[PDB]
Amino acid sequence: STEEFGKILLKVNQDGSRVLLRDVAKIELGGENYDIIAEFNGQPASGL
Amino acid sequence: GKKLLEAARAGRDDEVRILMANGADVNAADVVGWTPLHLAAYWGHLEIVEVLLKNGADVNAYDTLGSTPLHLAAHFGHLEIVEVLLKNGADVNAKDDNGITPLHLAANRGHLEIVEVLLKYGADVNAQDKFGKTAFDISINNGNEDLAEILQ
Amino acid sequence: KVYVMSEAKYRMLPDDIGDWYVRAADGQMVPFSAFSSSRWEYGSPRLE
């Protein structure tokens, strides 16, 4: 899950502060790639 | 006892009564120290948890890593079993060998209602595990804000 | 083949886990018990 990825611990600061992955990135499900977008009669679609 | 452990896990209510009426040890323990209560708690068998308790099952039995049935119930989100266990005197602040409490486990999986019940029976919010973490610490790290405010 | 593995008597009991040590960057030997926690749970021995 994105929640689990977001709390990935990148480092602890000298003052004991924590830097989590979500503190340097946006975490979301999203396409392996974003190059291909299809429409069926002008409406958002996928297909095979 | 072995039949009981098995019946407890399979959620076979009637079977549990039968071996009970034939007097099998309520506190029988398998190789990892799980009692029939541990088993019913883990798998979510509410009615079997109740039959076992009224037959004098140790509500505070612990396995070979110090974990009680209340740990299991809280961790796996079995709100009713949690309440039944608590109403029957389950130690709400019970720690396993890791210093982990039922509140730690409920918090960590975000079982808000369960968290509230545990607090209702006087869970120690400041209780730390072996790494010095509280339930609050856990809610923050998980970025659970709903849970986080309930813990303040 | 050459195989490395614990001798049987040190990988038989749950308590054996904390008898294994890792060496930290600063040369210190650290037992598994200092950076881990454990619990019993159920799982499948054969996923179809």
UniProtKB/Swiss-Prot annotation, chain A:
Disulfide bonds: none
Domain of life: Bacteria
Location in or out of the cell: Cell inner membrane
Induction of its expression: Positively regulated by MarA, Rob and SoxS transcriptional regulators (at protein level).
Disruption phenotype: Loss of susceptibility to contact-dependent growth inhibition (CDI); inhibiting cells still contact the target.
General function of this protein: AcrA-AcrB-AcrZ-TolC is a drug efflux protein complex with broad substrate specificity that uses the proton motive force to export substrates. (Microbial infection) Involved in contact-dependent growth inhibition (CDI), acts downstream of BamA, the receptor for CDI. Its role in CDI is independent of the AcrA-AcrB-TolC efflux pump complex.
Family, per entry: Belongs to the resistance-nodulation-cell division (RND) (TC 2.A.6) family.
Subunit architecture: Homotrimer, with large domains that extend into the periplasm, interacts with AcrA and TolC. AcrA may be required to stably link this protein and TolC. Interacts with AcrZ. Part of the AcrA-AcrB-AcrZ-TolC efflux pump.
Protein name: Multidrug efflux pump subunit AcrB
Covered range of the whole protein: 242 to 289 of 1049
Curated annotation (Swiss-Prot), chain C:
Up-regulation conditions: Positively regulated by MarA, Rob and SoxS transcriptional regulators (at protein level).
Compartmental location: Cell inner membrane
Effect of inactivating the gene: Loss of susceptibility to contact-dependent growth inhibition (CDI); inhibiting cells still contact the target.
UniProt record similarity statement: Belongs to the resistance-nodulation-cell division (RND) (TC 2.A.6) family.
Assembly, per entry: Homotrimer, with large domains that extend into the periplasm, interacts with AcrA and TolC. AcrA may be required to stably link this protein and TolC. Interacts with AcrZ. Part of the AcrA-AcrB-AcrZ-TolC efflux pump.
Function (record text): AcrA-AcrB-AcrZ-TolC is a drug efflux protein complex with broad substrate specificity that uses the proton motive force to export substrates.
UniProt-recorded name of the protein: Multidrug efflux pump subunit AcrB
Gene name for this UniProt entry: acrB
Full-length numbering of the shown residues: 770 to 817 of 1049
